[PDB]
Amino acid sequence: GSHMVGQLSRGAIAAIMQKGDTNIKPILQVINIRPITTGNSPPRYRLLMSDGLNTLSSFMLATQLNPLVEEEQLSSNCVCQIHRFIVNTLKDGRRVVILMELEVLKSAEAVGVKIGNPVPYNE
């Protein structure tokens, strides 16, 4: 429907990264998904997600959610509710938001476009 940016939890990315809020169940859009280099361990997917205001490229799917990408079209443009996530910090100090449970509210094909004009979140 109209006001597509109203579909997304504007400000949730800043809340996750600055406040470390994990109680929220924000609605985000997938902008892109790609594998990372994992050698002889399970494939792992990194996501560029949008909350309508910001994009952030430091999301990863928990391994348990891999089938959503492999089989069920979790893909660019879909709109998802994040039901459970955590944030982990790597040795270099960068943070990764690991999506543990998520629900696709609208398929990529039902949305079809990057909603709004989100800009990259800076650290």
Ligand SMILES: O=C(O)c1sc2cc(-n3c(S)nnc3-c3ccc(F)cc3)ccc2c1Cl
């Ligand atoms: O394929 C490649 O050669 C590389 S080198 C490479 C280096 C990083 N990287 C960054 S940034 N900061 N620290 C590291 C790093 C990663 C793994 C490691 F043990 C040591 C250091 C991250 C990914 C990556 C990849 Cl992928």
Ligand SMILES: O=C(O)c1sc2cc(-n3c(S)nnc3-c3ccc(F)cc3)ccc2c1Cl
């Ligand atoms: O400074 C750089 O350019 C490089 S090149 C470079 C290459 C590696 N590296 C080698 S060798 N073999 N596997 C890896 C590796 C890359 C990414 C990763 F997740 C784990 C391991 C690890 C760190 C690194 C860094 Cl740091």
Ligand SMILES: O=C(O)c1sc2cc(-n3c(S)nnc3-c3ccc(F)cc3)ccc2c1Cl
């Ligand atoms: O977004 C990120 O986390 C990273 S980590 C990261 C690490 C590298 N990197 C380093 S250091 N040394 N070699 C590489 C490298 C990794 C993969 C590749 F095919 C070619 C080169 C290059 C880009 C990049 C990016 Cl981009």
Ligand SMILES: O=C(O)c1sc2cc(-n3c(S)nnc3-c3ccc(F)cc3)ccc2c1Cl
């Ligand atoms: O293959 C690749 O493109 C990459 S990029 C890449 C980046 C990292 N890395 C380091 S160090 N510190 N934070 C991260 C990082 C990992 C996933 C992510 F969402 C954001 C950041 C570790 C491995 C890796 C690999 Cl492997």
Ligand SMILES: O=C(O)c1sc2cc(-n3c(S)nnc3-c3ccc(F)cc3)ccc2c1Cl
């Ligand atoms: O700095 C560190 O402690 C770590 S942890 C770490 C983990 C990975 N890695 C591989 S393989 N498969 N999935 C991941 C992974 C990366 C980031 C993350 F959130 C969770 C998992 C790749 C590089 C790296 C580095 Cl570099």
